[PDB]
């Protein structure tokens, strides 16, 4: 539907994603994706990071969260790096982050943090070429509470690719988030969106 020449504020990337979900809808797949993501969020919320890696994250994963530099809507000449990687992790790198979370000398983890995630707006569509690959889009509100009166709330859209792996379990092979707040007001982005 979308014509980005007319819909002036829409990026080509965003228009491509609209197209993938508006066509060919499979209700059962949407339900499967909802289950997958709800279970993922549950594992993360209880800080079962090893279980998350083992049950939800594929060996070939790319887990990426970018922060895009604010540029003019009419900008057409400045062509330098548009973004930076808050996260751009392979499986090993996620594992390092998980070990860091679990280390008994991670002083910031005592007293124990409290996480609550809200996953909504789930959409799912099979990839046209890799019949093994399932595109899942979802939005997350992530609430982190610690040390009595520190409260940080994150908001984001997630563009995921999930593929069945060993044992035929669907696992995350790509997560992409373009984080919507340019200057973070949550002390850090040390949460798994």
């Amino acid at each position: 539907m979308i014509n980005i020449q007319e819909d002036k504020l829409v990026s080509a990337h965003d228009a491509e994603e609209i197209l993938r979900f508006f066509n060919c809808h499979d209700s059962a797949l949407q339900q499967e994706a909802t289950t997958l993501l709800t279970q993922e969020a549950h594992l993360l919320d209880i800080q079962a990071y090893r279980a998350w890696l083992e049950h939800c994250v594929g060996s070939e994963v790319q887990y990426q969260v970018i922060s895009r530099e604010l540029r003019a809507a009419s900008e057409r000449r400045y062509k330098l790096n548009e973004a930076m990687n808050v996260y751009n992790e392979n499986f090993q790198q996620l594992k390092v982050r998980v070990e860091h979370q679990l280390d008994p000398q991670n002083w910031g983890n005592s007293p124990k943090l409290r996480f609550t995630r809200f996953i909504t707006n789930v959409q799912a569509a099979m990839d046209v070429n890799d019949k093994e690959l399932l595109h899942i889009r979802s939005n997350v509100i992530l609430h982190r509470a610690r040390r009595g009166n520190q409260v940080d709330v994150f908001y984001a859209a997630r563009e995921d690719k999930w593929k069945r792996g060993e044992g035929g379990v669907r696992k995350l092979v790509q997560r992409f988030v373009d984080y919507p707040e340019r200057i973070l007001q949550t002390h850090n982005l040390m949460v798994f969106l």
Binding site: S67, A72, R77, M84, V86, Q93, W107, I183
Partner: protein, 447 residues
Amino acid sequence: MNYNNKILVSESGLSQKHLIHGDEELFQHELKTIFARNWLFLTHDSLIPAPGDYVTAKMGIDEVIVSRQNDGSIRAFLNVCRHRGKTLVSVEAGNAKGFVCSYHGWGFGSNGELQSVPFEKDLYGESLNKKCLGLKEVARVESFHGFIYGCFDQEAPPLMDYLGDAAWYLEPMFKHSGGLELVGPPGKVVIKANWKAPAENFVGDAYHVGWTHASSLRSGESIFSSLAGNAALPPEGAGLQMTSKYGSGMGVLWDGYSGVHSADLVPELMAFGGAKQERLNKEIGDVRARIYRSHLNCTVFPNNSMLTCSGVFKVWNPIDANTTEVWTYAIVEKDMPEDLKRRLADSVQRTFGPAGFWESDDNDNMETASQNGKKYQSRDSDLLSNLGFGEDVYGDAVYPGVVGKSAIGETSYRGFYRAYQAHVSSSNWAEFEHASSTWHTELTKTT
């Protein structure tokens, strides 16, 4: 508070009143005596290389536009319209020949000049003196091997003199390496700490590494990992500490070229830095070539810090006494392969960026130490920086500055806060100089 007389920093920079990290009246006074007076990091050539390229930057709490001119120079201007005071530029970077104000449409050039006013002839006739209505210009803008700094005070020393003895230590990496580029855009995050908390930590705190970063060392897969949980102390002359007249200082950890980077980069970097060092031995001598491939944790007074080798580059932008906006860039050597450049930039952000696992170790330390400075019973308490006092030297035959010939100490804290006191109690640069005529003698007392 009478800043002429108040002893905020004790003699030889041995201690500081805790209130310096929490007192808002002092914060306002720093805007005048620290931020409006000293050199502040703006950008890098690599970020505004072509005519018309610009970025916005903070200078203290002020925001400026920093623009590459047609003649190749850089000028910087307050990001505030000369008419009714609206913020001129709302983006972080771009390319343009001028900037038009969205309120009444006044048009300014990239050179700050007021170039056009809508309906000038019909409304103002010949009454408008545009020549007097250019954007408020940052008086001084200078470069250190591509790194651009600004200063609002025309009376400041040249940037090179301001770096003082620290320049000698930075040159192998900043100059003799062939040059560095700054990889943007930066990460940006607000922390509930005073700007001095991270600044002091980066300028001379190696003591915290093994304990604060125990988890990151252990998990991280890095060259400094033997330190995790203070399981081990650095060797012999594993390094040194230095400080200078104008406040800048750093720690030196010999040979730690892979820095905080994960094992997925250690072999590659250790090869690359060693190869370059071999070539530099013939050009700058063995000591300086080794400094090139040694990890420097440095603060360029007041609020710009960095970890060379690791490639971390920080700006601690002040918001209020317990709020700082942290900007994090990556620095890379220009002659590195472009795939290495990319991986190094991601690794910098991976460890010290918004979701930097090492950075996260430091946050509670910085935040609570700052916040405790507001608490009634702690305001007049003394923060200690006496480690290594009475063992520092001045005028060494090989290593310049006030130097502590040990990897772990508080030498650089003392010099940072010797300069900070001198500024807070001075009304201008001349007074700062008068207050600093015996700076090294003060720092090396009892030795």
